[PDB]
Amino acid sequence: EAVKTLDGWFCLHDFRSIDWAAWRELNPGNQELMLNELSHFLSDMEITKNIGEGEHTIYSILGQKADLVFFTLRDSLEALNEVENRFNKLAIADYLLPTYSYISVVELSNYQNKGVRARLYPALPPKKHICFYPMSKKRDGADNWYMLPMEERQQLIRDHGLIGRSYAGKVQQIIGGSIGFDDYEWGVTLFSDDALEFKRIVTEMRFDEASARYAEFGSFFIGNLLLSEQLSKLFTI
Amino acid sequence: AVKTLDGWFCLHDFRSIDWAAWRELNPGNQELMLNELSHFLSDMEITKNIGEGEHTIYSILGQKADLVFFTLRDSLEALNEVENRFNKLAIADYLLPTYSYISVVELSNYLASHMAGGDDPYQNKGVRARLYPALPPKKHICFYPMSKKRDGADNWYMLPMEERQQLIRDHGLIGRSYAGKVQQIIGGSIGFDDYEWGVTLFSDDALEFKRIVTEMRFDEASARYAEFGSFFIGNLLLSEQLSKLFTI
Amino acid sequence: KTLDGWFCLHDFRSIDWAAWRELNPGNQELMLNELSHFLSDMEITKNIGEGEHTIYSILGQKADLVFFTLRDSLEALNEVENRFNKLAIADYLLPTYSYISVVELSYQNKGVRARLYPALPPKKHICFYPMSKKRDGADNWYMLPMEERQQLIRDHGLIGRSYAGKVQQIIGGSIGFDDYEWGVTLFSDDALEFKRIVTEMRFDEASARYAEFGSFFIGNLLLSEQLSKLFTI
Amino acid sequence: KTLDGWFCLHDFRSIDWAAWRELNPGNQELMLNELSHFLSDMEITKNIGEGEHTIYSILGQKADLVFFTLRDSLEALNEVENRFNKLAIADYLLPTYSYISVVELSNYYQNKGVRARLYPALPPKKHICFYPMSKKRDGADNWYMLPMEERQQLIRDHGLIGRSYAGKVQQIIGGSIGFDDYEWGVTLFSDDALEFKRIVTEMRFDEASARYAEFGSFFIGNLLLSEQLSKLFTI
Amino acid sequence: NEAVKTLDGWFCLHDFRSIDWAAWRELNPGNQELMLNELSHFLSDMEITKNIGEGEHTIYSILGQKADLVFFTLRDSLEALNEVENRFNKLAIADYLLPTYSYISVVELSNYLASHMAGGDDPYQNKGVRARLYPALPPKKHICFYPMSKKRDGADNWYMLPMEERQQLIRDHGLIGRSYAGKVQQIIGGSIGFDDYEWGVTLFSDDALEFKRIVTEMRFDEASARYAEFGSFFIGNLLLSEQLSKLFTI
């Protein structure tokens, strides 16, 4: 009955809110020293990316939920844990308050193939916007995904796939499975150069039976790509 | 599935004033920080006057917040830049974040907003007035988010289009009967925030908020399918109300 | 269809004893003096008929105090709240919950005016909770026909009548104003009457099937003397 | 309809060890002495029959301690709470949960057995269990829409289970409709903590709870007398 | 109708902590060392209790913001468990270990299936049963913890089911778990009366993806598909003394 999956990089979505009042009290010398240390940390992460042992990206997040997200991908939970712990021990991380996080593993569902590695070990596209949200499938009375027969689930997933293929080109998706790893069953990351495409695809999916009847959603997070010019501007008072 | 036209990107930024910290400042430094905020708001007025956005400030009743800063911009980048520049104001250390909402001004296709044809609606001046709304200086504001239910037999997203259209039509008739008393901005937020719409109402009589929201609750579109978040009510704040508000 | 009266704020506060204790007694006295001035101001608004207010001490950790204020506009209620938060002593009164509503009755008449603009009875105890009516499957209040709801409300009213002289109720409507649909304030000189009336109503179909309840807060009347004792540390 | 006895406060606290640790031992001793005089005053009220109180240490992070106090009026209970909060040591006792209720006897005052139940002596049992609960009002599972006779039968079967734990678990049922966020506060006392798991599991398979019970958080702990109270606070 | 009966072993604490890096960074290295020395002394005391057979314990570093560390401790009484918790909180270093979540439970073996022959024997004298009630913790690379309860929701009400139907549902769930022998080791802690859910579930594995595999497969089995209500999930990596010293080095 059960889905069987292929699993790739382990993923951390780390959402932080900047403690502006504390940061403002820091002398501008201390601020520069802490950003220099962060900049070294990010150069090391870029090395890991260039040799193909992981990926990462940073977006600034709208609204009060976060000021930024660090999305990091590694080939083991141990390497992910070490990134996280080294990040938290940066001086600047004392000013980066934790507001939400998500742990997942890039997932390919069965519903060395170079076309599989590309999905399992995704290079992150440098699109202007990111959207993240977690979700689960419902187990609620007669709307119970996990009691459906495989044939009916397969039909529902087929229809859902047709919609997303029509957004190829506009929206790039990474689906992280998180059963056993976090509080929902998937973490969904979307990338696009037009944020309205996130609204468009997620709305269209909500009227397809697989989501209309069976999706349960967490919080949504949207943001804008942060390279270094925007990162340094971000922190300048 | 519903199709939408989409206009300005919206931030409702709710803040609570840290009176105890503010009180610790001497009035000289308080004035300096208020001057910096006025300069900030003067810049926001320029953006408004060149047609690139809108903004307004209301004082909020109860402990949920003291103020809301409602800001509208033509891109997420611009909205993000306002937000970040605002948090970096000196006075913002005394404005504690208590809630926020991200949405985009939305016109659905459940009813027609213009004569059908190849003529594209973004060039229709009536449509543009709705997508890029002028904010009216009404005495009061009401904000809340909402979603449509997907709950057993009450599942909005499993209804056929013609049934959703009828439900929306009937909802619209009620709202139309509050013309001249309540003005509404509907921000779509599927993909952007935790509910599916952020609803902003404006009126000179706060009791019209209770009236319309109650009346709609007995209409099937809301009675059967609405799920509501928290409600925020407040009073218009111009400069007079603002420096007054911060005089301790 | 409802008639609407005073706008209401229930403002729950927990006292920051650790910080209060750090103040020398002279500064404590100055802050209490300021608070008494503010409260005498509130009493003046009451005595000219432009509002009401009362203060109860709250049991349990949810709060130490509730300030229940009623005013004739949202602007006036906002000004009171803001002037309150600017008192020096308010820095020691940490906000733990609040509720916004308007007195509701479903205008020249004196018995109506007595309901819409209620005098607050000096009863020993208070009980506050918000509630809404369910929209949940077959238990959907707002999908009922008019005449079915009228019958359900009728029966709930008979119960209330039997508590005349035991419990006095103020019902604030809050659709459009806060997170639930009504704020319910009860006053009695016997706190057990709160339990009795609210239990009795819970077996009546209007509440048994359709009520959704928030948190409950219960308290004891604070006059000037009990206020000074409260803060003596 | 019910009979109602003492008003009850369950007051859960976590100790601020970092701040307590900053105090020199003489000041720590002065604050504990003040708490000792407060508890000896509480013992006078207990000895005269005007209330009761006990203290248990609580397992896990929800609390370090529970102060469970019973008084014959809401005013007396409020006065205990406020005096407690104004103890110097209370700055180090952070409030993490509380519950207000009244000892309850349903019909599903001069009698000596009735009075022993309304105004209960707290047994010095090794362990305590506290949890609040309400009866469901959810579609076909609606306790408050049941006919009186069906409810009487469901309570009867529930009481049969409780009777079989006589001598193992002692229970205090506090009504809280009108007073706190659930409908009852349930306090269990036993010398064997597994009896809590046994009685609560067995009740959960009895229809009255299987269909109709809605539970809040559960707290368990160990009796703290004077001996153990001093060691709790010794760093 | 017929309630489950259980055998119950060690009382358990799952104690999740987040490290207050900002505060820890402000200590000079000499004082950090003293605090880590004291912690090592407390852990060697834990080890002594393990090595005389009166309890167990283990430490994992947790991924994500929910915690940096979990301390999982097992003891033969609630008093001993409470004493360990209180001594831990009074360590100097514990000021830097902020509480983010905890769970209290007791190692549970129910009677849905047999764990030993019904020949009249004391199950607590059966060494196989004892190995389960007083489990030695395996030094597997990864841990997974989550609490869960069984639904009492309309037509999906576990506690209204007949014994023989619950037994069938448990039986089928067990066959799935049996298929993960050698890949996932489970400890089931019962928590009815002790904490906010009905069980705490701890999984150990050298491959974290086996957690995802077993929990996903059980979620398509009726016992969980229809009746499970889950709390939060925590996953982590084994921490021995060496990884502990690295964790706290800035």
Ligand code: FEC
């Ligand atoms: C966005 C978004 C969501 C979450 C929102 C919602 O669920 O409402 C979303 C949700 C899910 C979820 C769960 C699953 C897994 C469900 C399960 O395993 O039971 C899940 C699984 C699949 N998705 Fe999915 N998605 N999705 C896209 C975007 C979104 N998708 C785009 C775009 C494409 C197309 C691009 C591509 O395939 O490379 C796409 C295609 C697939 C295919 C391939 C189908 C096919 O080949 O026909 C599978 C399998």
Ligand code: FEC
């Ligand atoms: C207030 C309020 C709420 C939220 C509370 C509740 O819905 O219970 C409220 C909620 C919503 C929600 C969601 C939606 C989007 C639903 C969807 O796209 O599924 C949503 C969408 C629409 N509303 Fe709405 N509303 N609303 C008014 C006030 C409120 N409205 C007033 C006033 C007018 C009248 C404007 C006028 O004067 O011409 C009005 C009209 C419309 C129209 C135009 C319909 C038509 O043309 O007939 C659309 C589309």
Ligand code: FEC
């Ligand atoms: C207590 C309590 C609650 C909340 C708990 C619950 O509803 O379970 C409570 C709740 C409500 C709620 C909502 C409503 C409005 C519901 C709606 O409009 O849909 C609501 C409305 C009414 N109540 Fe109510 N109550 N209530 C009393 C106490 C409580 N009442 C007592 C006492 C009296 C006795 C009357 C008196 O002597 O003054 C009494 C009477 C009325 C009347 C009488 C008709 C009239 O206003 O002309 C109306 C209408």
Ligand code: FEC
């Ligand atoms: C434990 C526990 C709970 C909460 C957990 C759950 O509900 O699953 C629990 C829950 C409740 C609740 C509510 C009520 C009231 C519900 C209502 O009035 O609607 C409630 C009410 C009663 N209980 Fe109850 N209980 N309970 C015991 C333990 C527990 N009890 C033990 C032990 C005895 C043994 C009695 C004795 O000491 O003489 C016992 C007996 C009674 C009687 C006895 C009446 C009679 O003598 O015929 C009444 C009435």
Ligand code: FEC
């Ligand atoms: C993983 C996981 C979960 C939680 C996730 C979920 O969806 O359930 C999980 C959840 C639970 C829960 C509650 C219960 C208690 C059910 C109840 O008493 O209502 C519960 C109870 C049992 N489990 Fe369970 N599990 N489980 C395994 C893994 C998981 N298990 C593995 C592996 C094995 C295989 C062991 C082996 O053969 O070596 C295994 C077997 C059993 C047996 C059979 C042995 C016995 O009599 O104790 C019982 C009973």
Ligand code: NA
């Ligand atoms: Na932000």
Ligand code: NA
């Ligand atoms: Na306010």
Ligand code: NA
């Ligand atoms: Na209190």
Ligand code: NA
């Ligand atoms: Na504890």
Ligand code: NA
């Ligand atoms: Na972590």
